């Protein structure tokens, strides 16, 4: 975020400002985060209450995403939410009962389950079948 | 699972009486510097 009012920095909407900041604007595209959150949140498993989303911002900010949230699908109001989140450190529901989006203290491990399996998405790594992988993993643990 | 919409402002501003009070502080400080 940056004051012009505070706006989420974008690759296309803002080009001169990030150049002044000296950051490579190629890595300045929050829509990829937007699209993922949409599919992760809209996936049936999230509806089944078996999914929680964590976000490690490139600056090092770790964000809590409550499964109950419903992010906007329009990219503009998506950004308007996170400028609010980044500055206010949290987001409250319309009914004012639970904080859907909350920033949390690093590292991620303390927030992760006691018994959990950790993996990354690597193009170079061996190709696997997700369904077989999850089956062979234990039950009490988490992925 | 329950679904609740997020609450947020379209444009974030980090009533008028407080705005009045803020200007008093600015005017007071500027007057203080001039007097010194």
């Amino acid at each position: 975020t940056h004051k012009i009012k505070y706006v989420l920095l974008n690759c296309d909407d803002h080009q001169g400002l990030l150049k002044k900041m000296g950051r490579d604007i190629s890595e300045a595209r929050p829509d990829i985060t937007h699209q993922c959150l949409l599919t992760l949140l809209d996936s049936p498993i999230n509806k089944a209450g078996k999914l929680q989303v964590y976000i490690q911002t490139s600056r090092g900010i770790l964000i809590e995403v409550n499964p109950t949230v419903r992010i906007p699908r329009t990219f503009k109001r998506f950004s308007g939410l996170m400028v609010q989140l980044l500055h206010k450190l949290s987001i409250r529901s319309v009914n004012s009962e639970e904080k859907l989006l909350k920033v949390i203290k690093n590292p991620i491990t303390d927030h992760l389950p006691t018994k959990c399996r950790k993996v990354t998405l690597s193009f170079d790594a061996p190709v696997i079948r997700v369904q077989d992988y999850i089956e062979k993993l234990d039950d009490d643990e988490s992925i | 699972i329950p679904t609740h919409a997020p609450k947020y402002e379209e444009n974030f501003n980090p009533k008028m009486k407080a705005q009045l009070k803020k200007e008093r502080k600015f005017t007071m400080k500027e007057i203080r510097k001039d007097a010194k």
Binding site: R70, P72, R73, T74, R77 | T3, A5, P6, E10
Partner: peptide, 11 residues
Amino acid sequence: RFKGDDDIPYK
């Protein structure tokens, strides 16, 4: 109740 592709309210 929001469902499917219904968007959060616009004000």
